[PDB]
Amino acid sequence: LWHEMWHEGLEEASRLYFGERNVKGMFEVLEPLHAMMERGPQTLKETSFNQAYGRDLMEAQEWCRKYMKSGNVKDLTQAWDLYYHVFRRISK
């Protein structure tokens, strides 16, 4: 569940974004993953996952939601810094 799903989706969303320049597909893979989180931590691993990446992923999503109001990719370059930061850590 949580660490695995985020590592697979974030690869996929970046494939869509950086490889296929597809912002709608990127937000489509990502947004359901942001939703399961709303729930909140509840298991040992979901509690440590939330503690290192929760604040970070919440912030990425707000640059994505800042984007939808500005149409400016700088917002998305900012989202992906945080996204890739989480991804490095979910593999180390």
Side-chain angles (χ1 to χ4, degrees), residues 2-3 40-53:
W2 279 31
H3 296 242
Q42 308 185 180
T43 75
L44 247 31
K45 279 176 198 175
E46 295 182 328
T47 299
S48 69
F49 184 91
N50 184 250
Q51 192 187 26
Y53 324 106

Side-chain angles (χ1 to χ4, degrees), residues 57-72:
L57 291 166
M58 277 177 250
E59 197 180 300
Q61 172 173 243
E62 240 295 274
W63 280 111
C64 286
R65 281 60 227 171
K66 286 197 70 273
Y67 174 76
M68 300 309 278
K69 274 255 171 162
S70 52
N72 183 90

Side-chain angles (χ1 to χ4, degrees), residues 15-55:
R15 190 186 59 77
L16 295 162
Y17 186 60
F18 294 103
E20 268 219 313
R21 293 163 177 221
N22 189 175
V23 173
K24 175 198 56 190
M26 173 216 156
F27 284 1
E28 254 146 17
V29 171
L30 253 33
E31 185 153 67
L33 284 169
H34 283 283
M36 75 189 188
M37 299 293 270
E38 295 180 313
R39 187 189 129 229
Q42 308 185 180
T43 75
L44 247 31
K45 279 176 198 175
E46 295 182 328
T47 299
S48 69
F49 184 91
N50 184 250
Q51 192 187 26
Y53 324 106
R55 26 159 175 166

